[PDB]
Write an enzyme that holds these catalytic residues in place. Structure first.
Site, PDB file in Angstrom:
ATOM      1  N   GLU A 145     -50.737 -14.129-127.277  1.00 55.68           N
ATOM      2  CA  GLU A 145     -50.027 -14.096-128.600  1.00 55.68           C
ATOM      3  C   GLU A 145     -50.650 -15.431-129.149  1.00 55.68           C
ATOM      4  O   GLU A 145     -50.095 -16.115-130.278  1.00 55.68           O
ATOM      5  CB  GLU A 145     -48.356 -14.602-128.372  1.00 55.68           C
ATOM      6  CG  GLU A 145     -48.237 -16.045-127.645  1.00 55.68           C
ATOM      7  CD  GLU A 145     -47.993 -15.997-126.167  1.00 55.68           C
ATOM      8  OE1 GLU A 145     -48.474 -15.015-125.532  1.00 55.68           O
ATOM      9  OE2 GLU A 145     -47.345 -16.797-125.704  1.00 55.68           O
ATOM     10  N   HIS A 188     -43.582 -13.209-129.789  1.00 51.83           N
ATOM     11  CA  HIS A 188     -44.063 -14.494-129.476  1.00 51.83           C
ATOM     12  C   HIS A 188     -44.141 -15.197-130.701  1.00 51.83           C
ATOM     13  O   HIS A 188     -44.254 -16.361-130.761  1.00 51.83           O
ATOM     14  CB  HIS A 188     -45.235 -14.382-128.511  1.00 51.83           C
ATOM     15  CG  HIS A 188     -45.292 -14.469-127.290  1.00 51.83           C
ATOM     16  ND1 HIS A 188     -44.236 -15.421-126.554  1.00 51.83           N
ATOM     17  CD2 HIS A 188     -45.511 -13.624-126.286  1.00 51.83           C
ATOM     18  CE1 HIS A 188     -44.052 -15.021-125.170  1.00 51.83           C
ATOM     19  NE2 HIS A 188     -45.145 -14.198-124.716  1.00 51.83           N
ATOM     20  N   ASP A 192     -51.469 -21.258-112.954  1.00 52.76           N
ATOM     21  CA  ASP A 192     -52.107 -20.167-112.661  1.00 52.76           C
ATOM     22  C   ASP A 192     -51.884 -19.538-111.502  1.00 52.76           C
ATOM     23  O   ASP A 192     -51.690 -18.181-111.383  1.00 52.76           O
ATOM     24  CB  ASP A 192     -53.761 -20.009-112.503  1.00 52.76           C
ATOM     25  CG  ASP A 192     -54.223 -20.324-114.168  1.00 52.76           C
ATOM     26  OD1 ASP A 192     -53.526 -19.835-114.971  1.00 52.76           O
ATOM     27  OD2 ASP A 192     -55.246 -21.033-114.206  1.00 52.76           O
ATOM     28  N   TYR A 202     -40.087 -13.680-116.828  1.00 51.99           N
ATOM     29  CA  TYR A 202     -39.879 -12.821-117.726  1.00 51.99           C
ATOM     30  C   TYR A 202     -38.828 -11.875-117.386  1.00 51.99           C
ATOM     31  O   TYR A 202     -37.841 -11.707-118.448  1.00 51.99           O
ATOM     32  CB  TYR A 202     -41.175 -11.674-117.616  1.00 51.99           C
ATOM     33  CG  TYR A 202     -42.411 -12.224-118.024  1.00 51.99           C
ATOM     34  CD1 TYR A 202     -43.351 -12.875-117.234  1.00 51.99           C
ATOM     35  CD2 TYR A 202     -43.035 -11.717-119.189  1.00 51.99           C
ATOM     36  CE1 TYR A 202     -44.283 -13.490-117.798  1.00 51.99           C
ATOM     37  CE2 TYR A 202     -44.286 -12.017-119.719  1.00 51.99           C
ATOM     38  CZ  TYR A 202     -45.089 -13.213-118.907  1.00 51.99           C
ATOM     39  OH  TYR A 202     -46.394 -13.332-119.259  1.00 51.99           O
TER      40      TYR A 202
HETATM   41  N1  LIG Z   1     -48.346 -15.516-122.875  1.00 49.82           N
HETATM   42  C1  LIG Z   1     -49.282 -14.165-122.568  1.00 49.82           C
HETATM   43  C2  LIG Z   1     -49.557 -14.053-121.199  1.00 49.82           C
HETATM   44  C3  LIG Z   1     -50.043 -15.301-120.359  1.00 49.82           C
HETATM   45  C4  LIG Z   1     -51.064 -15.934-120.408  1.00 49.82           C
HETATM   46  C5  LIG Z   1     -51.429 -17.229-119.674  1.00 49.82           C
HETATM   47  C6  LIG Z   1     -50.466 -17.654-118.916  1.00 49.82           C
HETATM   48  O1  LIG Z   1     -50.912 -18.771-118.064  1.00 49.82           O
HETATM   49  C7  LIG Z   1     -50.018 -19.051-116.769  1.00 49.82           C
HETATM   50  C8  LIG Z   1     -48.731 -19.896-116.729  1.00 49.82           C
HETATM   51  C9  LIG Z   1     -48.292 -20.166-117.960  1.00 49.82           C
HETATM   52  C10 LIG Z   1     -47.137 -20.987-117.855  1.00 49.82           C
HETATM   53  C11 LIG Z   1     -46.353 -21.012-116.601  1.00 49.82           C
HETATM   54  C12 LIG Z   1     -47.257 -20.580-115.446  1.00 49.82           C
HETATM   55  C13 LIG Z   1     -48.026 -20.005-115.445  1.00 49.82           C
HETATM   56  C14 LIG Z   1     -49.205 -16.962-118.749  1.00 49.82           C
HETATM   57  C15 LIG Z   1     -48.861 -15.858-119.708  1.00 49.82           C
HETATM   58  C16 LIG Z   1     -48.710 -12.836-123.337  1.00 49.82           C
HETATM   59  N2  LIG Z   1     -47.835 -12.179-122.411  1.00 49.82           N
HETATM   60  O2  LIG Z   1     -46.881 -12.877-121.973  1.00 49.82           O
HETATM   61  C17 LIG Z   1     -48.109 -11.058-121.985  1.00 49.82           C
HETATM   62  O3  LIG Z   1     -49.021 -10.478-122.498  1.00 49.82           O
HETATM   63  C18 LIG Z   1     -47.222 -10.251-121.218  1.00 49.82           C
HETATM   64  C19 LIG Z   1     -47.609  -8.923-120.846  1.00 49.82           C
HETATM   65  C20 LIG Z   1     -48.045  -8.992-119.336  1.00 49.82           C
HETATM   66  C21 LIG Z   1     -49.143  -7.954-119.006  1.00 49.82           C
HETATM   67  C22 LIG Z   1     -50.286  -8.354-118.394  1.00 49.82           C
HETATM   68  O4  LIG Z   1     -50.835  -7.620-117.543  1.00 49.82           O
HETATM   69  O5  LIG Z   1     -50.389  -9.703-118.691  1.00 49.82           O
HETATM   70 ZN   LIG Z   2     -45.318 -13.240-123.218  1.00 46.98          ZN
END
Ligand SMILES: N[C@@H](Cc1ccc(OCc2ccccc2)cc1)CN(O)C(=O)CCCCC(=O)O
Ligand SMILES: [Zn+2]
Ligand SMILES: [Yb+3]
Ligand SMILES: [Yb+3]
Ligand SMILES: [Yb+3]
Length: 610
Positions: free
Chosen positions: A271, A299, A375, A383
């Protein structure tokens, strides 16, 4: 007391706060470096502030200038995945609310965990290199020095010089381009982000990009080879943005562009403000994976406007976003579809709880990341258990219309702020002051702090799920005399969404007998489907059911794209199948140098290599 961001080594928001970032850097593909200066406008929150600490990770610091002069600074020793703390001495003691600008000349490492540098061979065009960042959760510190915590929000302006043949884009409004007067052959792109954002939302991409406008405030970007397909796939973007505005209030970021990254992008999307990043695995050809776009759009309110104060409260970002995401899809395709997706989400939560184990601390909604690499903790739990909590509250408090009223008030109340679970719950009680007795029926302790599945399961419409259940149960319980009766006609009235759910239900009961899986391919020809979600689940089912023919298909999918949602489980299933184990390990070893740095690290840990 004071909520601590245990993932940051920087001075906390209660000491000082970064208000603005002015970035001037140049992208050098020959040396795989981003070099420049980061001008941080910092505001003290205490009297007599004489020094501050910033986060950095594998950064080369040339100097730090304050008011035209160079100042003293020290780099502490590295603290594993957290990087190294950078203490800067202020030439003058600051008192509450006094500001100062610190300019840091730095250079990133080619091994920066925030960046992936692709050789031209790794791109669609084969003629130019490509670069993209991914800062969430804590990789911004691997690009520039900063208070790398979501508890701090700053505005930013940026100027980036790149090979004139390439395009640079950021999580900001495009502010024009011009020839790099300093040294031609390079071009300089300008960006402006006037809305304060947590630094994990700072993003940059550099490559041979082309765009196609698909909405009044939306351009789709990708290499030429993917423009048309992307323009087609994400056509519903503006309609989703209009629904999201109705649900969360005005979209305040201006532009909502989309960037379709190379296959190795690690997530479904990111996002980044003004420029959502999405995986090319969403290009199914029929717009069926558009919920990921609805998700990134959402988001823009939950996560980008109202932000979790520390990663321990990450569910606030994701639960509410999945909740909005599903309302957008429900507005576009029906309440029945919303419920269908909601129930599929509960199934993914069951899966995550089973994988981790029902007593695993990572299955709690509010987690403690002290000494835990984010990570490594990342999963579907925030979610889906978060969505389940909100869906349950929706039903308990009177329905979607009533609960959406709360959601919009919540967004407005905390816009431009970073908050905790208590801020959210305290406001929920404040908003529903006339239903405190109902709110007091909620087992908050279990929902927020207990591991495993939620203490109560919401109610779900079953209209679209029933056919998936019938078909999955028929396969799970099939005997020799049932195999000849399955037929392609079984899929007659099933959407791709339902085929995916069918597979997800069947996968929960894997392995299936080898003869049963062979028969499934004979009658349904799932090998021919290119929709990534379906192919992913089907290949997992094949590998888990011990079909050797599926090994090359799974290895191919696991390496030709790098979305971790797919790549990690595929390598993990291949490693668990005796027939493909050695090949899985060798394939990872052969590919790791070319993988995204975080994916390479996680798959190596999953495969137990090194
Ligand atoms: N926020 C971004 C995804 C994202 C990117 C990076 C991280 O970082 C790791 C983390 C962040 C916070 C707590 C624990 C771990 C966490 C989530 C957007 N998003 O939530 C999605 O695109 C969800 C779709 C899931 C599909 C996929 O395969 O990624
Ligand atoms: Zn998200
Ligand atoms: Yb140097
Ligand atoms: Yb250098
Ligand atoms: Yb039978």
């Amino acid at each position: 007391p004071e909520i601590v961001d245990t993932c940051s080594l920087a001075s906390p928001a209660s000491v000082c706060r970064t208000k603005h970032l002015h970035l001037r850097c140049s992208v050098d593909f020959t040396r795989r470096t981003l070099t420049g200066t980061a001008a941080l406008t910092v505001q003290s929150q205490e009297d007599n502030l004489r020094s501050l600490v910033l986060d950095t990770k594998d950064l080369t610091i040339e100097k730090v200038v304050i008011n035209g002069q160079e100042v003293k600074y020290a780099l502490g020793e590295r603290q594993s995945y957290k990087g190294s703390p950078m203490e800067i001495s202020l030439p003058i003691a600051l008192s509450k609310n006094q500001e100062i600008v610190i300019e840091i000349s730095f250079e990133t490492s080619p091994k920066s965990s925030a960046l992936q540098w692709l050789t031209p061979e790794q791109t669609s065009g084969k003629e130019h290199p490509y670069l993209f960042s991914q800062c969430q959760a804590i990789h911004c510190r691997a690009i520039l020095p900063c208070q790398d915590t979501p508890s701090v929000k700053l505005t930013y302006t940026a100027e980036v010089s790149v090979p004139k043949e390439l395009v640079a884009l950021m999580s900001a409004i495009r502010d024009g381009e011009t020839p790099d007067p300093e040294d031609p052959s390079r071009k300089i792109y300008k960006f402006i982000q006037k809305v304060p954002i947590p630094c994990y939302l700072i993003a940059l991409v550099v490559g041979a990009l082309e765009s196609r406008q698909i909405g009044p405030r939306t351009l789709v970007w990708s290499e030429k080879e993917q423009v048309e397909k992307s323009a087609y796939e994400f056509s519903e973007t503006e309609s989703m943005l209009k629904i999201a505005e109705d649900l969360g209030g005005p979209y305040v970021w201006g532009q909502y562009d989309l960037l379709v990254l190379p296959p190795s992008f690690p997530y479904g999307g990111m996002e980044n403000p003004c420029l959502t990043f999405v995986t090319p695995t969403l290009l199914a050809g029929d717009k069926s994976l558009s919920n990921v776009i609805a998700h990134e759009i959402s988001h823009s309110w939950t996560g980008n406007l109202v932000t979790n104060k520390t990663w321990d409260h990450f569910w606030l970002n994701e639960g509410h976003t999945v909740y909005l995401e599903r309302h957008i899809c429900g507005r576009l395709f029906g309440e029945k579809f919303r419920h269908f997706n909601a129930l599929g989400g509960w199934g993914e939560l069951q899966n995550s709880v089973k994988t981790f184990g029902e007593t695993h601390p990572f299955t709690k909604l509010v987690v403690d990341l002290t000494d835990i690499d984010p990570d490594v903790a990342y999963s579907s739990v925030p979610y889906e258990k978060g969505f389940a909590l909100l869906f349950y509250l929706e039903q308990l408090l009177g329905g979607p219309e009533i609960f959406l009223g709360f959601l919009k008030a919540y967004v407005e109340k905390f816009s431009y702020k970073s908050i905790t679970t208590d801020d959210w719950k305290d406001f929920l009680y404040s908003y529903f002051k006339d239903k405190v007795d109902v709110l007091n029926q909620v087992d908050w302790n279990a929902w927020l702090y207990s591991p495993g599945l939620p203490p109560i399961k919401p109610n779900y419409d079953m209209t679209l799920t029933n056919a998936c259940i019938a078909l999955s149960q028929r396969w799970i319980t099939a005997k020799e005399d049932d195999l000849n009766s399955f037929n392609a006609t079984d899929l007659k009235d099933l959407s791709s969404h339902q085929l995916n759910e069918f597979l997800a239900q069947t996968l929960q009961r894997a392995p299936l007998p080898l003869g049963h899986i062979k028969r499934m391919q004979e009658v349904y020809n799932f090998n021919a489907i290119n929709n990534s979600e379906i192919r992913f689940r089907w290949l997992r089912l094949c590998i888990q059911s011990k079909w050797e023919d599926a090994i090359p298909l799974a290895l191919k999918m696991a390496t030709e794209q790098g979305r971790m949602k797919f790549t990690r489980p595929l390598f993990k299933d291949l490693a668990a199948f005796d027939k493909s184990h050695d090949q899985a390990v060798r394939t990872y070893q052969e590919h790791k140098a070319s993988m995204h740095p975080v994916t390479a690290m996680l798959v190596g840990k999953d495969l137990k290599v090194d």
